Amino acid sequence: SKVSVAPLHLESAKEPPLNTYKPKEPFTATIVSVESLVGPKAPGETCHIVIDHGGNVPYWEGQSYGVIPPGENPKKPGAPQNVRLYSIASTRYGDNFDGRTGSLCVRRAVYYDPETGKEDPSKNGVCSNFLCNSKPGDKIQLTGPSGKIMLLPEEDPNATHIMIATGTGVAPFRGYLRRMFMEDVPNYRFGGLAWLFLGVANSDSLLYDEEFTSYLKQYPDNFRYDKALSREQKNRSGGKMYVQDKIEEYSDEIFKLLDGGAHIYFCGLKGMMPGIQDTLKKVAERRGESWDQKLAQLKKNKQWHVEVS
Ligand SMILES: Cc1cc2nc3c(=O)[nH]c(=O)nc-3n(C[C@H](O)[C@H](O)[C@H](O)COP(=O)(O)OP(=O)(O)OC[C@H]3O[C@@H](n4cnc5c(N)ncnc54)[C@H](O)[C@@H]3O)c2cc1C
Ligand SMILES: NC(=O)c1ccc[n+]([C@@H]2O[C@H](COP(=O)([O-])OP(=O)(O)OC[C@H]3O[C@@H](n4cnc5c(N)ncnc54)[C@H](OP(=O)(O)O)[C@@H]3O)[C@@H](O)[C@H]2O)c1
Ligand SMILES: [Mg+2]
Incomplete structure (x- = not known):
């Protein structure tokens, strides 16, 4: 039958959370797990990332989290990287049914030269690879939800x-x-x-x-x-x-x-x-x-x- 979820107070809000955390002061969440969702014949890797927000960044289904990957903005030296948005792939209770985690479904953006097929890691997508390269315990700067x-x-x-x-x-x-x-x-x-x-x-x-x-x-x-x-x-x-x-x-x-x-x-x-x-x-x-x-x-x-x- 149906899986018990907690806490029920996540049903109490009448409006969705929005912009609880903003880019200048993100929430430092922690990776729980990263796993590939796809088999060897898939044209690229898509991964499932479980993020522990501790109940600090609740959301409703259909919303997105922002992720600020580490590093400096290439187009604004000294500035942090721009937010990338990811549609949340979990319910508000998350994959552990406890209201503490959210999950992302992330396709690695990989660059191949259109003529030679040669990969160029410097042209790969920053945030998508950052996420799919993450390991349990790594920290993630989260914004939103939005x-x-x-x-x-x-x-x-x-x-x-x-x-x-x-x-x-x-x-x-x-x-x-x-x-x-x-x-x-x-x-x-x-x-x-x-x-x-x-x-x-x-x-x-x-x-x-x-x-x-x-x-x-x-x-x-x-x-x-x-x-x-x-x-x-x-x-x-x-x-x-x-x-x-x-x-x-x-x-x-x-x-x-x-x-x-x-x-x-x-x-x-x-x-x-x-x-x-x-x-x-x-x-x-x-x-x-x-x-x-x-x-x-x-x-x-x-x-x-x-x-x-
Ligand atoms: C509301 C919303 C929800 C989203 N939800 C999801 C989701 O659930 N899952 C998901 O996977 N994505 C989602 N996206 C897309 C996501 O936000 C990112 O845009 C995507 O992951 C790529 O970001 P990145 O940081 O990896 O790539 P970036 O570093 O932003 O690079 C962008 C692209 O440019 C390419 N590139 C970089 N440099 C060069 C160069 N010199 N020459 C040619 N190409 C280059 C990269 O390979 C990449 O394809 C969503 C977007 C929005 C707006
Ligand atoms: N809220 C959001 O805005 C949001 C949330 C999640 C994802 N996204 C975006 O959604 C996209 C998902 O891409 P992905 O890399 O996961 O998928 P993908 O593997 O590039 O494509 C998924 C499927 O769509 C097919 N497809 C390609 N062009 C199409 C068209 N014109 N009409 C219908 N189907 C078409 C692809 O087929 P072929 O490749 O064989 O042509 C493939 O079978 C990403 O760009 C991601 O950023 C947006
Ligand atoms: Mg499969």
Whole structure:
């Protein structure tokens, strides 16, 4: 059954925490663990980082933490590095169910020369590699939390939530789904439909697949899960199979859910949104509907939630 979480007072706040810690005085958190989430055929390493904030930096699902990697800002000598934001991949209780830790899902940004394929570590992403190189006991300068776009609307505990993720964009949805299905949260008993669409390069690049597959077996009437493996599958037009192609496979069901009030969420690569828009426009046209008018209504009704970068 559902996992006991503590402390219940994390349910008491009526507003999300925002900017509890600021860049000039970050919170010095401590790494609990770092593990790779991916197999040897993944095009790069994505890691899961558990950070002990001690209950000092609580957050709500869908928010981000800022991380200030060590060193000086290259474009401002004597200045600290700029904050990098990471969508929190844990619930407010965290992976130890105690309100003391939060987790990040971090893709290492690695530079390869486009001609020779030669790596150049000096051009690798600073914060992503800092995080995935971290070890238990290391310190992390945390800021935030921040963000409200991806807060989970809980007013209707039987709402429908359609979650579209590419890569580490799955992060907020891991938190949503743990709150919906895994944790014993007495004041939020989810009885709606949660539908996760996840796009990753191949099977080895799947993130948290065992957890999501477990929800299919535990909550078959409340959870659906579809994957787009871009380098393992092709769409009906011959392109790499992307999440928008999976959305198209369920176009009638998704449109009906949207018409019925479903929330739809997009997180991950900003480049997926033009493709999604094109697909939804095409679906709508085949149904004799205007996607522009439908999207305008979804936005007006606060059903449309996008955080991509
Ligand atoms: C709200 C929000 C949430 C986010 N959530 C997540 C998340 O959950 N997980 C996640 O992985 N990311 C997420 N990101 C992205 C994250 O904030 C960082 O931008 C990302 O990790 C890269 O930061 P970095 O410090 O590693 O790279 P940076 O050091 O900022 O470098 C940026 C890029 O430039 C490249 N680069 C550097 N120097 C050169 C050069 N000379 N020539 C060519 N290229 C170069 C690097 O390889 C890298 O790809 C999020 C972003 C936002 C805005
Ligand atoms: N809140 C936020 O804003 C937030 C949170 C988390 C992550 N992010 C961002 O989300 C991105 C996740 O990237 P990642 O490195 O984890 O993923 P990735 O491996 O680069 O891509 C994930 C999947 O998306 C596919 N993809 C590429 N272009 C696409 C398109 N135009 N439409 C649909 N799918 C497409 C990729 O396929 P191919 O590579 O095979 O084309 C891959 O299968 C990062 O840029 C990260 O910074 C943002
Ligand atoms: Mg795997």
